[PDB]
Design an enzyme around this catalytic site. Structure first.
Site, PDB file in Angstrom:
ATOM      1  N   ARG A  55       6.828   6.253  -5.276  1.00 13.14           N
ATOM      2  CA  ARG A  55       7.392   7.075  -4.213  1.00 13.14           C
ATOM      3  C   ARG A  55       7.276   6.287  -2.927  1.00 13.14           C
ATOM      4  O   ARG A  55       6.210   5.789  -2.629  1.00 13.14           O
ATOM      5  CB  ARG A  55       6.504   8.343  -4.096  1.00 13.14           C
ATOM      6  CG  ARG A  55       6.841   9.296  -2.980  1.00 13.14           C
ATOM      7  CD  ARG A  55       5.934  10.605  -3.060  1.00 13.14           C
ATOM      8  NE  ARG A  55       4.532  10.447  -2.605  1.00 13.14           N
ATOM      9  CZ  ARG A  55       4.169  10.394  -1.305  1.00 13.14           C
ATOM     10  NH1 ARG A  55       5.119  10.467  -0.314  1.00 13.14           N
ATOM     11  NH2 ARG A  55       2.862  10.238  -0.978  1.00 13.14           N
ATOM     12  N   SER A  95       0.871  -1.219   0.000  1.00 14.63           N
ATOM     13  CA  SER A  95       0.000   0.000   0.000  1.00 14.63           C
ATOM     14  C   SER A  95       0.898   1.257   0.000  1.00 14.63           C
ATOM     15  O   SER A  95       0.984   2.017   1.009  1.00 14.63           O
ATOM     16  CB  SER A  95      -0.967   0.009   1.197  1.00 14.63           C
ATOM     17  OG  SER A  95      -1.980  -0.954   0.989  1.00 14.63           O
ATOM     18  N   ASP A 134      -4.625  -2.297  -0.016  1.00 12.80           N
ATOM     19  CA  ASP A 134      -5.429  -2.988   1.014  1.00 12.80           C
ATOM     20  C   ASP A 134      -6.955  -2.779   0.865  1.00 12.80           C
ATOM     21  O   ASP A 134      -7.731  -3.714   1.215  1.00 12.80           O
ATOM     22  CB  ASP A 134      -4.972  -2.577   2.431  1.00 12.80           C
ATOM     23  CG  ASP A 134      -5.141  -1.082   2.657  1.00 12.80           C
ATOM     24  OD1 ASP A 134      -4.409  -0.245   2.047  1.00 12.80           O
ATOM     25  OD2 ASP A 134      -6.023  -0.715   3.410  1.00 12.80           O
TER      26      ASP A 134
END
Lengths: 484, 484
Positions: free
Chosen positions: B171, B156, B209
């Site tokens: 990132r 995630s 998630d």
């Protein structure tokens, strides 16, 4: 997110990788801590004998204190009643309006006692309490009341009473040290300050909180047969019958006759102080020898949540001394008495992981002890044994009260930090009852005798006992020994 | 003991003693923070336009990310599947056995990441994860497996994927700072480490998630129409239809046809970054201006639990500066940003006392501020307004998804610390759905659209998506854009 919101399934708990020498130690721990079903049956027989003995003229280790509630609440009572619950740091004032269909409405405040009251004068303590009661009544009844509000006072300090509207302090605890109160009846002391401030209240009952748990819960749940507290302290209350109370023979008026109910506050923490039936291990013996009163409170020491981490601490230290575990660790933090509180067996029992990472982080972080996974597996087995033993021994008091009175079915209204918060406690206690009675029953919600969450004993319960008491007082029915 | 074990009833919350000047400010706050049902409906219309915009070729503030799950779980899926969830402090490994009747069994471990992992090399990261997976498989499958275990990886972090079995990191977040991973596909990086250790696993899916929360809950609960996280962050996932996703036109193979379902990870925290529709106050403006990314995550800033205390801190400081409250107190604690976390409005909302003694103790102990009872009544009202506004604005996202897709009945599978723990949040959100739809319904179980607890998205969800994806991969059915 994380493991999702639902209760994780229990870990599988494979022992396949545990070396034989540790498996032998785990099996040794199972023989020390397991309570068989037949062992529980044996303890219950003795427990029933000791309930009987505490009610006899000669008495016994269990106080079996008559609570002077000589009727069952029906759930059909109506009206406005107050409760005062006086703790060591705070008091709570509760207005309970009884709806007459096993229902009630509450309005309650809590007041922190200033720190100098505990060692101040009698008058200033009762003045402070009356001031809190005036402020509360003035707000909730701005135009006054048609009749004075009856109040029930939870005063859970060593006290004796020969009638419900009385409480002679035996000795201050929970911090207090005020002169002129030990040996005196507190009910008139509180009432005098109430009248000094012209507050329309009559103090009609003084109680122990567990008697209040019984009564508040029977008012809402007519299947209630017992009130039980399973926390730091332990206690139980239930209704016996006057013909079963030899120590009251010759003391009661005819309107508390032999077939009258009588609430009993057992204060059964002292069951088996003779050390005959409870399965005390060397670790329990150490706890007792190192406790403030060695030889007292045997049943409490064996069932309270307070000691469950300390049992583990002493077992782990013994295993470390014998060379089995924590071999290259600095175990200095483990040598501190009570450094492991009840959160230790609770977090260890709640760990959902096969590698027991919660238990790893608990030991590394709090104790500076690194563990192998097989060490943690021994730790988890040990926590399970300790939580399960405490539940199985607590239910012996339940089963003894039920068998004493012939209750084949019952709701047992329960409260206390172990019942409310200890992992899997409700399952452990239900399996324990099923084991004792050998019931053929699939689901725990269908068990004949079952623990259910209690109503508020020290607030609601004191207010409902005030109701029951005022009904008697108004009619001229006795609520105490002849003449008192 | 204490107030007994059952949720106390709500306090009466009389405002009779509040002076007129303070009562004007209380009513002002109620007007400022109440979201009318008419305003909820308007917000929902703009929210739907923004969901459509995010799926368009030109795009919008709402990412509307295709999740590459192009089928619904039926509940008849069977077999053994693995999930990995990599968080910033630990990773979780989960073996999920699917039973074929909307049912499953889990076996899980949790591995705390070594201190150095977050800042070490890519090789160190993927080799650690592979080692954890080797130790886990070697234990639960000591004789190996007859086919490799398919694995779902919940990753995630900002990432793009052109197929489910890929994730190109954009990132790092959560404190990670690893060279040579941003701009690269992490799936082969993990697979290479698994293969170096000869572990019989194929990484077949990478997911967010929230996508997991949708699919795991639909597997177990056939009424599920959305997965929603309401916590520190917020997100929602649901199934759209490929013909409704203009930005995929021209990019899909024939076997992901116009009528195929497509899970969407909305990442709707950025809804109304334009600051045109959500009912911000000056206090929300200060939070945004003082945040790490001003003008970003507008909807998250108005619905996450992370900011609920800070909204109260600013309101309270504004009222102090205006001369209304805490006159003569030392309010320096009120001046510290984020001094008040979510526990503040939570504890305040739970306070059962008419005199708000829990709120009194919280402010004195934690903030060094003495309050009058009337100040506490303002504080309590403000906490209720803040928790309620957050719930109703989250429900606008739910209602936008249902109305976009024509769902007139739905279970909304919910998770996250706000849904799971914020006081009264489930009743707040149910009332908000009844208000927006103007349902004539008394009981919550009769509500046609209801939030229910989610199944575990990052474990069970990832494993169930691995299962769905494996079936496609084995058959040669696409799970991504042409050629990828």
């Amino acid at each position: 997110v994380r493991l999702g919101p639902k209760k994780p399934p229990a870990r599988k708990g494979s022992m396949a990788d545990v070396p034989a020498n540790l498996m032998e130690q785990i099996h040794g721990l199972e023989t020390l801590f397991t309570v068989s079903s037949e062992k529980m049956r044996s303890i219950v027989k003795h427990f029933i004998s000791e309930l009987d003995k505490g009610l006899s003229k000669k008495g016994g280790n269990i106080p079996m204190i008559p609570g002077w509630v000589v009727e069952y609440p029906t759930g059909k009572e109506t009206g406005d009643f107050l409760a005062l619950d006086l703790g060591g740091t705070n008091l709570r004032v509760v207005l309970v309006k009884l709806g007459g269909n096993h229902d009630f409405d509450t309005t309650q405040n809590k007041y922190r006692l200033p720190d100098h009251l505990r060692t101040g004068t009698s008058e200033q303590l009762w003045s402070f309490i009356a001031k809190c009661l005036k402020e509360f009544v003035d707000e909730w009844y701005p135009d006054g009341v048609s009749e004075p509000l009856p109040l029930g006072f939870t005063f859970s300090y060593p006290a004796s009473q020969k009638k419900i509207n009385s409480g002679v302090l035996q000795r201050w605890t929970k911090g207090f040290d005020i002169e002129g109160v030990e040996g005196h009846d507190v009910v008139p002391m509180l009432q005098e300050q109430i009248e000094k401030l012209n507050i329309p209240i009559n103090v009609v009952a003084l109680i122990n909180d567990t008697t209040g748990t019984l009564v508040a819960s029977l008012y809402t749940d007519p299947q209630t047969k017992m009130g039980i507290i399973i926390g730091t302290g332990v206690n139980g209350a239930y209704y016996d019958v006057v013909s079963g109370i030899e120590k009251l023979e010759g003391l009661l008026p005819e309107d508390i006759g032999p077939d009258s109910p009588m609430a009993i506050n057992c204060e059964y923490g002292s069951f088996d102080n003779e050390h005959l039936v409870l399965p005390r291990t060397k670790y329990d013996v150490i706890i007792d020898e190192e406790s403030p009163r060695p030889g007292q409170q045997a049943f409490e020491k064996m069932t309270s949540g307070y000691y469950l981490g300390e049992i583990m601490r002493l077992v782990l230290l013994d295993l470390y001394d014998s060379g089995f575990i924590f071999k290259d660790q600095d175990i200095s933090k483990l040598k501190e008495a009570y450094v492991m509180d009840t959160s230790y067996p609770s977090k260890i029992e709640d760990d959902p992981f096969e590698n027991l990472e919660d238990t790893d982080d608990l030991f590394k972080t709090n104790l500076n002890i690194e563990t192998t996974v097989v060490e943690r597996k021994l730790i988890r087995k040990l926590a399970e044994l300790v939580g399960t033993r405490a539940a199985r021994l607590t239910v012996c008091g339940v089963s003894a009260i039920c068998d004493k009175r012939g209750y084949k079915t019952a709701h047992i209204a329960a409260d206390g930090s172990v019942f409310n918060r200890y992992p899997g406690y409700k399952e452990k206690a239900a399996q324990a009852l099923k084991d004792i009675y050998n019931w053929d029953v699939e689901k725990m919600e269908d068990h004949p005798i079952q623990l259910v969450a209690a109503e508020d004993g020290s607030g609601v319960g004191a207010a409902i006992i005030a109701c029951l008491t005022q009904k008697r007082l108004a009619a001229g029915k006795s609520v105490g020994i002849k003449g008192e």
